[PDB]
């Protein structure tokens with residue numbers, strides 16, 4: 417296992433889908449809010465819908 | 467443009483991820499996007515330009 | 524190169 421800063425890991429996930437990594441760093445706060453909100457919706461889905 | 471910016475503290479370099487191969491940081495192995503304010507954790511170092519000494523010659 | 528080629 418090689419440690420890497422998590423934002424840079426997401427940058428290389430983005431290059432893995434042809435989105436140029438500057439698109440991540442120019443939007444990082446927005447992406448973090450979307451990701452945190454999306455995980456939140458899973459808890460409501462599982463809590464409501466057994 | 468490919469790989470990672472890395473430093474031994476005394477210098478800055480770029481390499482591909484899967485094997486250490488330090489190269490100087492340049493207008494050829496980098497691309498610009500916008501002003502510095504937006505990027506979290508950005509740093510200051512002189513990006514070299516291979517054309518410059520040739521315009522000086 | 525076009526704007527740089529003043530040299």
Ligand SMILES: *[C@@H]1O[C@H](CO)[C@@H](O)[C@H](O)[C@H]1NC(C)=O
Nearest residue numbers: 421422423505506507508509
């Ligand atoms: C990085 O983490 C250190 C503590 O480990 C902290 O002092 C510093 O402000 C952090 N910088 C960024 C850009 O997160």
Ligand SMILES: *[C@@H]1O[C@H](CO)[C@@H](O)[C@H](O)[C@H]1NC(C)=O
Nearest residue numbers: 502503507508509510511512
């Ligand atoms: C980077 O350089 C600029 C201009 O010299 C300076 O304003 C800025 O404070 C520097 N960055 C840091 C982290 O100090």
